[PDB]
Amino acid sequence: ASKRALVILAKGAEEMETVIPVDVMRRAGIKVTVAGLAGKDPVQCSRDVVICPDASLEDAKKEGPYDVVVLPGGNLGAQNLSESAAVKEILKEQENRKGLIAAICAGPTALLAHEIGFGSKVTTHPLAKDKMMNGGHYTYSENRVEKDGLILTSRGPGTSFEFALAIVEALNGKEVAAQVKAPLVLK
Amino acid sequence: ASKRALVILAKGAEEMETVIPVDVMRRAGIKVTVAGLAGKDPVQCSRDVVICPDASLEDAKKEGPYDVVVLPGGNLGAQNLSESAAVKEILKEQENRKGLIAAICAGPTALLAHEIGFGSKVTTHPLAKDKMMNGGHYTYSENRVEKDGLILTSRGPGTSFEFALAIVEALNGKEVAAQVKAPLVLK
Numbered sequence A, B: 001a002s003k004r005a006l007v008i009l010a011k012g013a014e015e016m017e018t019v020i021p022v023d024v025m026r027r028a029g030i031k032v033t034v035a036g037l038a039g040k041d042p043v044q045c046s047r048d049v050v051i052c053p054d055a056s057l058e059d060a061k062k063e064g065p066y067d068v069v070v071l072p073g074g075n076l077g078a079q080n081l082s083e084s085a086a087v088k089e090i091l092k093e094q095e096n097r098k099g100l101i102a103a104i105c106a107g108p109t110a111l112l113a114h115e116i117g118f119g120s121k122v123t124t125h126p127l128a129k130d131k132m133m134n135g136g137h138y139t140y141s142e143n144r145v146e147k148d149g150l151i152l153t154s155r156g157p158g159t160s161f162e163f164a165l166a167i168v169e170a171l172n173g174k175e176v177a178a179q180v181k182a183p184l185v186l187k
């Protein structure tokens, strides 16, 4: 069967970090659900792009489990993810079932908020490093994409393609990732 | 005053090629209007991301002139742009007033449809080359971004950051482009 991705979309999400992985994952034949944290209403992203989610998180959570849960960045978006009890539950369940969690930019700070994957080597946006490292619960990396088992992290809008292709490789393999990559005109 | 950008959004537009330039231009302090070709209703992009435009093209056209008109790609999006009388009028006026026109991926084929910038050196997505070159009205380039005077073109999702930063440099200069570039974590 096809793999399934849940992308959690909150007000203030970085729209490039949301759209690039959604699009690339769909190119890879992954069934992606864009789930609105606050409900099924349009979401105003960090640079004012307005995205209509496929479903509310409340509804999407009922259609699990997912092979990857994806957390976009954006400072304010990540803060919303970090404050959400629903997100905490989803990430705990995903970690418990040994499913992939992928977070980019400020997104990984939601892992810290929900005590997910402590001990992992992680990266974040440079400006989110101090927040992520509060308490020393992770080991920091400057790699553009970092993967430590089932915790996959990345740095910013400019690493979003690498991040998305790493998700594709983890779910559908190296060959599919290479096939999806070529028409993008990367490098 | 601030520079102004019109981004024309049609069904089937490549969402990465729409969102990356909108976001990057807004980071550069450009006033960007995302205008829906078909009206103010949500637009279903090529990989099913749904974007709510800021205004209909019909309304946005009345708020000109713009310092750049931006045409995203996506095969079906570009076909819609190519078939639009409103787009033809907008591009003709922009060319006539010596304003920048920027098109990415399949987007430049709309320039061909509306007889804009003939003689220019241009690039497109590799799969859109034959369409763009029908009749030999342009000279083709494999550069990731090509700028020939006021006609700025680029190749695909993976060149969208370069394309957007080239627009920023053209409008707001090299220093602003460099300032906007650094927090993106490109390369």
Ligand SMILES: [Cu+2]
Pocket: A014, A017, A073, A074, A075, A104, A105, A106, A125, A155, A156, A157
């Ligand atoms: Cu970011």
Ligand SMILES: [Cu+2]
Pocket: A042, A050, A051, A052, B042, B050, B051, B052
């Ligand atoms: Cu919408």
Ligand SMILES: [Cu+2]
Pocket: B014, B017, B073, B074, B075, B104, B105, B106, B125, B155, B156, B157
């Ligand atoms: Cu394209």
